[PDB]
Design a protein around this ligand. Structure first.
Ligand SMILES: CCCCCCCCCCCCCCCCCC(=O)OC[C@H](CO[C@@H]1O[C@H](CO[C@H]2O[C@H](CO)[C@H](O)[C@H](O)[C@H]2O)[C@H](O)[C@H](O)[C@H]1O)OC(=O)CCCCCCCCCCCCCCCCC
Ligand code: CLA
Ligand code: CLA
Ligand code: CLA
Ligand code: CLA
Ligand code: CLA
Ligand SMILES: CCCCCCCCCCCCCCCCCC(=O)OC[C@H](CO[C@@H]1O[C@H](CO)[C@H](O)[C@H](O)[C@H]1O)OC(=O)CCCCCCCCCCCCCCCCC
Ligand SMILES: CCCCCCCCCCCCCCCC(=O)OC[C@H](CO[C@@H]1O[C@H](CS(=O)(=O)O)[C@@H](O)[C@H](O)[C@H]1O)OC(=O)CCCCCCCCCCCCCCC
Ligand SMILES: CCCCCCCCCCCCCCCC(=O)OC[C@H](COP(=O)(O)OC[C@@H](O)CO)OC(=O)CCCCCCCCCCCCCCC
Ligand SMILES: CC1=C(/C=C/C(C)=C/C=C/C(C)=C/C=C/C=C(C)/C=C/C=C(C)/C=C/C2=C(C)CCCC2(C)C)C(C)(C)CCC1
Ligand SMILES: CC1=CCCC(C)(C)C1/C=C/C(C)=C/C=C/C(C)=C/C=C/C=C(C)/C=C/C=C(C)/C=C/C1=C(C)CCCC1(C)C
Ligand code: OEX
Ligand SMILES: [Cl-]
Lengths: 55, 36, 56, 63, 31, 38, 36, 30, 82, 505, 34, 32, 341, 33, 30
């Protein structure tokens, strides 16, 4: 918690597997990320005016 | 039984894993699964 | 409020994918496991000092 | 201890405390039954699971 | 096909080399 | 009448019996050689 | 003709304290769900 | 009524704490 | 106490031990390498290679949608790749 | 003294007072059945077996009476909605009474056996100690269960001497109590074939009769008597608990999945009927048929019974509830009054659209309408600024066929939206939310509560089996391990076989 | 005078021989290009 | 707040009954 | 000596790895659950069941590999290799998810075997079987979560897949669909796990910091002989320290180690009850009174309502990809989102 | 009937509190002799 | 609920009667 306080965050494997053409081949990390994204865009729903939630 | 001293086999073994693991971390950046 | 904090933390930092929180889960699961183990093992080897009608 | 009419009548049914057949007695025969029952439970479950499908057996409300 | 063979190859070698090397001390195991 | 999955059922029934058989064959055989002493 | 199997039962003070704490904390926990 | 109830139970626990500390079975060396 | 077997400190320091296992361990390693380098692991387990996840112009996933037509569904999808 | 958690172990060497305790438990259970049934009679509304059946009103024991043939009340109604019936004594009221009387008789027998606890029957003639020949008792009790089980199957279920059992069609429309002939074929093992239930009890009954004969006549082998501590009554508890949780898991299972003994008119539908659109398919069959013989849309949908429409409604899905949402289903969505009719949505181009239905997993779900092919064509948007599929843009309407609204069509968007929000739940009904001050939140059915309780009790009783199983087999060390026990026993190598002192070196 | 083939023996080789095989397999995977 | 008014009695008996049970056992213990 | 008694002797021999009768169940089922997990995370995909890569072979790493659950369309099929779905075809068995049932069921039976082993060894050695009784809690968890929960749902698909990040996904599914954090049965489980870890640490540190001086070295580990009679630490000084620091202390060593058993064992059992509930979607999802108020009063907001808005995000954003067999299509415009994000 | 909701809790406590008091005193009386 | 309460109390009184009669302190002489 004390170092994620300084935004050194968990491993990121979003779109980490791709096929010969380059389609994204989802893994379980991408499914986690779909959940994270639901949390992200709903929390404090009236508090953000600009598109990145930088703190 | 006890011709090769234990400390030697320890170092050998250890440097053995270190290599295999090192390779797996290399592979995290090369080829399949590197996002590239 | 605590749940709120954990959910927002997961979205903002992917704490589940962080090794230190994985270490923390091994810490507390393993604490519980070893807690139950030690309690059960010492309890299993209590010396017969009582009858079956009184608390061991 | 109190004797009663009904007790006296029932007494023999509760008289062979501790009597046993020597050694292993009917154990092998019991194991055959257990083993048969198991294969029979297996058949029942696999029909309910539709792992085993049998002709004429439609595991649907439309039976 | 041909790969069922090459994959097993080193495994089979490895089995002879151990079996020929411990064959004597093995035969003792006999009481 | 006999269906494909019933033949499956028998296949696995016999596969399982054979696995059980070997195990105790092996085990009884060993335990008769490598015997405890009193 | 009194029954020879009768036994006296015990609960010491420490067990009362633990037991009361258990009940009170269970109540504080479930009460919200009972009121819903 | 619901507020009163939660506060009552909390209040009983605090009183339990007091007796369990100050009015415990004293440990002795048998 | 001693359950009767040969101590491990004793076996791994023994030369006879390494005579045997200087061969077998690398051999197993190379078997496993071969298992993948021959492409054999792909066909045993049915794992897509990098070029066989999708057909060239498809973006949908070959999801099995039937219990008993299931092994057939996979086969028919493996044909649409060629 | 005894710890609080061991109080009832004073009965272990007291067969008479054990029986007394067992009688009192029996009286309590019977008293409960009696009491529960009276409560259900006082609260049940019999006036509508179509839209307000028992399983909508939180009835738990009323369906078990119905299942085996009790269907009418001394007040003249039956659960099949037939008036002017004379059920004789075995109405719901008389079953409840008989369980109260029974409870009171058992209360009395428990007092006698508690006071006259020292009957000579319980004392081993040999040694004079209290003794129970459990092997012989099991034979007796098994023989008796076999006979009850046979007779229940041969007379009650067949209807040779008794009422039969609840049977219905595949869609729960015409249920009633009917004699059932046994199915001796392999379809007897189909949980959805009621004849299998008859056959089961006849064949198992006989087998129980014969097994009990064997267990009365032939003693257990010494090997099995020692290994299972057959002179210790805790062994019987351990194995009895094991069979109970096995039984409880099977009954949770068949309740959740559907069997011939858990019918949907008594317990409501299963969650799997919603998942597979089991009722929607059948409704559509009957409509397509009607339109094949020249009926109008209004005529074909007007011909669907309300009872069948009501099954195609997620509010009756048992997996839609919550753990502290208490009471009857009618306290959630309300008391169903009428089918509103089948809602047909069309966009501006006349093409018919289909609301995507709510899956059980979702407490809430968006409103998305697709065409026959699953292309999204309309939706209720969240962000409005870049919305391209809104009802206003796409000009969607709703027209009703059948039910209350047959022939009506709505074009104002706010109204089309509210009917689309309900179509995610399936067919749309009129509800009375006032009588019970219903809060609008789905509850589960008796199929739900039953399954939950029994799954939970089955799991807990596994723990009881482990607990009493261990106490039987380790009774020698319950109070603790032997104080004069040495490392040669527990350390390695001293012995060739663990535990066996005779294997030195 | 110890045995060389024991139950313990079977136990280590049921584990260790597949382990090395698997490792060589996983090693080779680090050189698969897409 | 539109709470369940059977919650008051469920909570109250949930506390009272088992607590009384404990108290009864403890007091009869202290007097023997 | 009959053949049974001779086989008994050989199975209960004092060897480096005790076998026993229990072993005939334990060692094959555990090796195969283990082996099937390794085999599947190393080589097997989830492409046809889930639309996901799941093996080292495909380029997954240790956190993202899984043996994944079979497709929803298999229902609760046992997925036997010789069953009607795979028809004996090993390759097709893997592709359809059969390793998941292979692992699930052999592990179920291996856990049985492990508990019987605890009973078998306790009996021969002569100790009370409290460790076996303690292992009941892991078994309750395993059965509730991996077996009962999917049997209540539509299929094995919704059980947990065997992987690090697959299990994380399971956690978040449980938050977004079941509001599992609000469930009092999970809350008791948390208490028993966290209090178990607390008991673990405080008992260890207490003993280590009340040791008697039994040798003259600075490494105090050498001053202990397992055959000694004496307590190696002071219960009396431990008790005084904690009475004065925290107000109460253990005084009874037996009660203290029984409590260490009880607390975590009882926590896991409570959590298992809750999951049986969720098998039926019988959730503690809402508080009706909060919802009646919130619906009528748009200025009423609590952390309860805030958390539901997050659940609503998780469901809509994750369902299409997490349940691909539903063919969920959510236009951009229906996706719930706050401002800007 | 439209009846005072608190009547129930009042009645239960009215019964329960004084009854438990009496039982407590009786049982500890029997544990003496 | 009021019906259940009334009958419950009445039922308790009848039970009390039973114990008061058959499980009384037995009067003993001198
Ligand atoms: C503690 C100690 C633990 C010891 C652990 C040892 C582990 C032993 C191994 C466990 C075996 C588990 C396999 C269970 C398979 C199962 O259930 O498989 C499920 C099948 C039911 O199959 C399902 O049936 C469903 C209902 O369909 C039915 O309903 C439909 C209605 O639309 C149609 O009519 C359809 O044709 C008709 O079949 C759907 O079709 C599902 O897709 C299909 O999977 O039942 C059956 O096999 C059997 C049904 C009898 C119940 C078996 C009891 C055990 C299960 C407990 C269940 C209660 C807990 C759940 C609570 C919730
Ligand atoms: C022709 C003769 C005949 C006929 C037609 C039947 C017909 C039937 N028998 Mg009967 N039976 C007969 C003779 C017959 N029997 C005889 C002679 C005996 C021996 C005396 C029995 C003994 C018997 C038993 C013991 C059972 C039946 C059951 C059944 C029913 C099976 C359908 C069903 O719902 O299964 C549903 C049941 C199953 C599919 C069995 C489930 C198996 C599970 C997996 C066992 C293990 C549970 C495990 C420990 C917990 C897992 C935990 C986790 C997964 C949650 C059906 C009515 C079963 C029943 O009552 O169903 C209600 C049952 O339990 N029969
Ligand atoms: C004296 C006879 C008698 C009769 C005719 C009834 C009749 C009835 N009771 Mg009542 N009951 C009785 C005694 C009786 N009861 C007693 C003594 C008690 C106290 C225990 C109760 C307690 C009671 C309750 C608690 C409830 C009823 C209910 C009911 C109704 C449904 C019955 C049902 O589904 O049972 C089904 C019974 C079973 C499914 C049990 C099956 C046995 C299992 C499978 C055990 C198998 C083990 C066996 C030994 C193995 C056999 C071996 C084999 C080879 C042969 C019905 C009107 C229900 C009701 O509606 O109440 C209003 C209800 O909920 N009863
Ligand atoms: C097999 C048991 C069983 C089942 C399945 C049902 C099922 C049903 N009953 Mg019935 N009931 C039963 C037993 C049962 N009842 C008994 C024994 C009684 C006597 C008290 C009643 C009295 C009764 C009444 C008075 C009513 C019902 C009603 C109902 C319905 C709604 C139930 C509800 O809202 O649940 C609510 C259940 C819960 C909120 C579950 C609470 C569980 C909590 C968490 C307690 C356990 C926590 C525990 C202390 C944790 C400790 C852990 C510790 C070990 C560490 C439903 C059809 C209602 C209905 O609609 O009737 C028409 C109704 O009004 N029942
Ligand atoms: C047929 C079922 C059955 C029977 C007859 C017994 C009988 C017994 N148990 Mg076992 N037990 C059972 C099931 C059973 N148990 C199950 C299912 C479990 C798992 C939870 C256990 C776990 C267990 C343990 C851990 C222990 C026993 C002990 C005992 C003995 C003393 C119990 C006592 O004095 O309690 C006294 C109990 C009280 C004074 C109050 C308990 C209050 C409970 C928690 C709430 C009341 C529930 C309520 C009345 C409604 C009933 C619900 C209904 C669905 C069952 C006694 C021989 C003890 C023993 O071995 O002694 C040597 C012991 O240590 N039992
Ligand atoms: C302890 C040993 C053990 C156990 C309990 C299991 C258990 C299981 N295995 Mg595994 N398995 C094992 C060892 C074991 N296996 C070994 C060593 C291997 C390597 C070959 C495998 C390989 C394997 C595969 C490849 C698969 C399984 C599968 C299964 C499942 C289905 C089994 C089945 O249907 O059996 C049916 C057969 C029986 C139940 C045998 C019955 C034995 C006889 C015939 C009973 C009748 C006796 C007779 C009537 C009376 C005689 C009395 C007696 C005294 C002689 C089950 C979970 C399947 C699975 O996981 O799918 C999801 C699967 O596909 N197993
Ligand atoms: C004995 C003395 C009393 C003991 C303490 C009593 C409180 C115990 C808790 C009772 C449940 C609390 C429910 C909240 C109160 C309430 O509103 O209920 C009230 C509800 C009834 O619901 C009422 O119904 C009314 C219509 O009749 C209206 O709908 C009311 O609005 C509604 O409140 O009570 C019940 O439904 C009875 C409970 C039966 C539940 C059995 C199923 C549960 C089985 C699972 C048990 C597993 C436990 C595992 C633990 C390990
Ligand atoms: C194709 C199917 C094959 C079987 C499939 C698997 C099912 C069987 C499961 C049993 C596996 C473990 C058995 C191994 C026993 C053992 O190695 O003994 C086998 C014997 C005896 O070993 C002996 O080992 C003994 C030590 S101990 O028993 O291993 O503990 C020792 O006391 C003795 O002197 C020594 O001779 O030795 C040989 O194998 C020599 C070759
Ligand atoms: C303590 C922390 C735990 C790890 C132990 C540290 C060992 C360190 C130890 O204390 O001393 C080392 C110990 C003793 O070996 P020797 O006596 O041969 O060595 C003496 C040496 O210390 C001299 O240098 O060796 C092992 O036990 C090897 C373990 C191989 C185990 C084989 C595993 C295969 C069996 C499968 C597992 C069993 C199944 C489970 C039950 C179903
Ligand atoms: C004496 C007599 C009589 C009378 C009778 C009577 C009157 C009876 C009644 C009875 C009754 C009336 C009974 C009752 C019972 C009940 C019960 C027994 C209950 C129980 C319950 C419970 C146990 C619960 C639990 C729970 C809870 C509370 C919560 C939730 C969960 C549960 C469910 C767990 C007569 C005349 C006949 C005859 C002569 C004699
Ligand atoms: C990562 C790390 C950090 C700390 C230091 C340390 C050096 C320990 C370290 C190293 C760890 C490493 C990389 C570990 C790798 C180990 C591996 C991958 C283990 C592989 C073992 C695999 C095994 C047995 C597989 C056996 C499979 C079995 C029987 C198959 C059984 C079967 C299946 C599954 C299906 C049907 C057929 C059959 C035969 C029934
Ligand atoms: O406040 Mn609490 O939460 Ca950390 O990020 Mn930015 O800020 Mn707000 O958003 Mn996302
Ligand atoms: Cl901002």
């Amino acid at each position: 918690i004390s170092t994620m306080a300084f935004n050194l965050n968990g491993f990121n494997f979003n779109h980490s597997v791709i096929d010969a053409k380059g389609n994204v081949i989802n893994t379980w990390a991408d499914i986690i990320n779909r959940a994270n994204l639901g949390m992200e865009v709903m929390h404090e729903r009236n508090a953000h005016n600009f598109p990145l939630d930088l703190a | 039984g006890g011709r090769i001293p234990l400390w030697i086999v320890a170092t050998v073994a250890g440097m053995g894993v270190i290599v295999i693991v090192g390779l797996f971390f290399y592979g995290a950046y090369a080829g399949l699964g590197s996002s590239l | 409020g605590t749940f709120n904090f954990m959910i927002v933390f997961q979205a903002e930092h992917n704490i589940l994918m962080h090794p230190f929180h994985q270490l923390g889960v091994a810490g507390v699961f393993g604490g519980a496991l070893f807690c139950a183990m030690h309690g059960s093992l010492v309890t299993s080897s209590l010396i017969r000092e009582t009858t079956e009608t009184e608390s061991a | 201890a109190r004797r009663t009419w009904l007790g006296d009548i029932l007494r023999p049914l509760n008289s062979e405390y501790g009597k046993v057949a020597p050694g292993w007695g009917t154990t092998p025969l019991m194991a055959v039954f257990m083993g048969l029952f198991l294969v029979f439970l297996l058949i029942i479950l696999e029909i309910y699971n539709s792992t085993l499908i049998l002709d004429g057996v439609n595991v649907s409300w439309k039976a | 096909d041909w790969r069922v063979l090459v994959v097993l190859l080193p495994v089979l070698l490895a089995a002879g080399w151990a079996v020929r090397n411990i064959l004597p001390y093995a035969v003792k195991q006999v009481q | 009448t006999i269906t494909p999955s019933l033949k499956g059922f028998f296949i696995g029934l016999l596969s399982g019996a054979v696995v059980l058989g070997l195990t105790f064959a092996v085990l009884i055989a060993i335990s008769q050689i490598d015997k405890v002493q009193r | 003709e009194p029954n020879p199997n009768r036994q006296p039962v015990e609960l010491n003070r420490t067990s009362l304290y633990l037991g009361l704490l258990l009940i009170l904390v269970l109540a504080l926990l479930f009460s919200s769900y009972f009121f819903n | 009524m619901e507020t009163i109830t939660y506060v009552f139970i909390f209040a009983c626990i605090i009183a339990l704490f007091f007796f369990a500390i100050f009015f415990r079975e004293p440990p002795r060396i048998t | 106490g001693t359950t009767g077997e040969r101590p491990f400190s004793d076996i791994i320091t023994s030369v006879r031990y390494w005579v045997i296992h200087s061969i077998t361990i690398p051999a197993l390693f190379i078997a496993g390498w071969l298992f993948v380098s021959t492409g054999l692991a792909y066909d045993v387990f049915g794992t897509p290679r990098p070029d066989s996840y999708y057909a060239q112009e498809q973006r949908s996933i070959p999801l099995v949608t039937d219990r008993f037509e299931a092994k057939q569904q996979v086969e028919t999808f493996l044909e649409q790749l060629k | 003294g005894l710890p609080w958690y061991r109080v009832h172990t004073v009965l272990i060497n007291d067969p008479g007072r054990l029986i007394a305790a067992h009688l009192m438990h029996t009286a309590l259970v019977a008293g409960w059945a009696g009491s529960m049934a009276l409560y259900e009679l006082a609260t049940f509304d019999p006036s509508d077996p179509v839209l307000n059946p028992m399983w909508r009103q939180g009835m738990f024991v009323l369906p078990f009476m119905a299942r085996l043939g009790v269907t009418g009340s001394w007040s003249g109604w039956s659960i099949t909605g037939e008036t002017g019936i004379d059920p004789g004594f075995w109405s719901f009221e008389g079953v409840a009474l008989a369980h109260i009387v029974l409870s009171g008789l058992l209360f009395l027998a428990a007092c006698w056996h508690w006071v006259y606890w020292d009957l000579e029957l319980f004392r081993d003639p040999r040694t004079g100690e209290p003794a129970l020949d459990l092997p012989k008792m099991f034979g007796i009790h098994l023989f008796l269960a076999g006979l009850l089980c046979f007779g229940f199957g041969a007379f009650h279920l067949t209807g040779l001497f008794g009422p039969g059992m609840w049977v219905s069609d595949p869609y729960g429309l015409t249920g009633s109590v009917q004699p059932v002939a046994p199915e001796w074929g392999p379809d007897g093992f189909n949980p959805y074939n009621p004849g299998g239930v008859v056959a089961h009890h006849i064949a198992a009954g006989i087998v129980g009769i014969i097994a009990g004969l064997f267990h009365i006549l032939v003693r257990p082998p010494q090997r099995l008597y020692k290994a299972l501590r057959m002179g210790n009554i805790e062994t019987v508890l351990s194995s009895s608990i094991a069979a109970v949780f096995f039984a409880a898991f099977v009954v949770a299972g068949t309740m959740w999945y559907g069997s011939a003994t858990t019918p949907i008119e008594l317990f409501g539908p299963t969650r799997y009927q919603w998942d597979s659109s089991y009722f929607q398919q059948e409704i559509n069959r009957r409509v397509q048929a009607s339109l094949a013989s020249g009926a109008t849309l209004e005529e074909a949908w007007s011909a669907i019974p309300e009872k069948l429409a009501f099954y195609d409604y997620i509010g009756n899905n048992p997996a839609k509830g919550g753990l502290f949402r208490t009471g009857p289903m009618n306290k959630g969505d309300g008391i169903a009054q009428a089918w509103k009719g089948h809602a047909v949505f069309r966009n501006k181009e006349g093409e018919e659209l289909f609301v995507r239905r709510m899956p059980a997993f979702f407490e809430s779900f968006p409103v998305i309408l697709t065409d026959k092919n699953g292309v999204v064509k309309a939706d209720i948007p969240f962000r409005r600024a870049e919305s391209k599929y809104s009802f206003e843009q796409q000009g969607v309407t709703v027209s009703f066929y059948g039910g209350e609204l047959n022939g009506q069509t709505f074009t104002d968007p706010p109204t089309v939206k509210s009917y689309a929000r309900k179509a995610i739940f399936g067919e749309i009904f009129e509800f009375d939310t006032e009588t019970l001050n219903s809060d609008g939140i789905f509850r589960t059915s008796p199929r739900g509560w039953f399954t939950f309780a029994h799954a939970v009790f089955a799991l807990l009783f596994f723990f009881g089996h482990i607990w009493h199983g261990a106490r039987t087999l380790f009774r020698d060390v319950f109070s603790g391990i032997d104080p004069e026990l040495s490392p040669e026993q527990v350390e390695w190598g001293f012995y060739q076989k663990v535990g066996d002192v005779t294997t030195r070196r | 005078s110890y045995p060389i083939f024991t139950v313990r023996w079977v136990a280590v080789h049921t584990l260790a021989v597949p382990t090395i095989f698997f490792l060589g397999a996983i090693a080779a995977m680090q050189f698969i290009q897409r | 707040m539109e709470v369940n008014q059977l919650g008051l009695i469920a909570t109250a008996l949930f506390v009272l009954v088992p607590s009384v049970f404990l108290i009864i056992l403890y007091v009869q213990t202290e007097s023997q | 000596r009959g053949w049974f008694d001779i086989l008994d002797d050989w199975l209960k021999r004092d060897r480096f790895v005790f076998v026993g009768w229990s072993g005939i169940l334990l060692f094959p089922c555990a090796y195969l659950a283990l082996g099937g997990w390794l085999t599947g995370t190393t080589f097997v995909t989830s492409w046809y069941t889930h639309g996901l890569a799941s093996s080292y072979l495909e380029g997954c790493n240790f956190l993202t590999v899984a043996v994944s659950t079979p497709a929803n369309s298999m229902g609760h099929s046992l997925l036997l290799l010789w069953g009607p779905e795979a028809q004996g075809d090993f390759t097709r068995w893997c592709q359809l998810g059969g390793l998941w049932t292979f692992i699930a069921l052999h592990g179920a039976f291996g856990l049985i075997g492990f508990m019987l082993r605890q009973f078998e060894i306790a009996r021969l050695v002569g100790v009370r079987p409290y460790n076996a009784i303690a292992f009941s809690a892991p078994i309750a968890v395993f059965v509730s979560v991996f077996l009962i929960y999917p049997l209540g749902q539509s299929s094995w698909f919704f059980a947990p897949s065997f992987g690090v990040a697959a299990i994380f996904r399971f956690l978040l599914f449980f938050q977004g669909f079941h509001n599992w954090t609000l469930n009092p049965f999970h809350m008791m489980g948390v208490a028993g796990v966290l209090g178990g870890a607390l008991l673990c640490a405080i008992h260890g540190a207490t003993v280590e910091n009340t040791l008697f001086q039994d040798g003259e070295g600075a490494s105090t580990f050498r001053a202990f002989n397992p055959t000694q009679a004496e307590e190696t630490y002071s219960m009396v000084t431990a008790n005084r320290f904690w009475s004065q620091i925290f107000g109460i202390a253990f005084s009874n060593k037996r009660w203290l180690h029984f409590f260490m058993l009880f607390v975590p064992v009882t926590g896991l059992w409570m959590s298992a009850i809750g999951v049986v509930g969720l098998a039926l979607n019988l959730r503690s999802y809402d508080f009706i009174s909060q919802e009646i108020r919130a619906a009528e009063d748009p200025e009423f907001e609590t952390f309860y309502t805030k958390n539901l808005l997050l659940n609503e995000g998780i469901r809509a954003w994750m369902a299409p990809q997490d349940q691909p067999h539903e063919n969920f299509v959510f236009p951009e415009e229906v996706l719930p989102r706050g401002n800007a994000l």
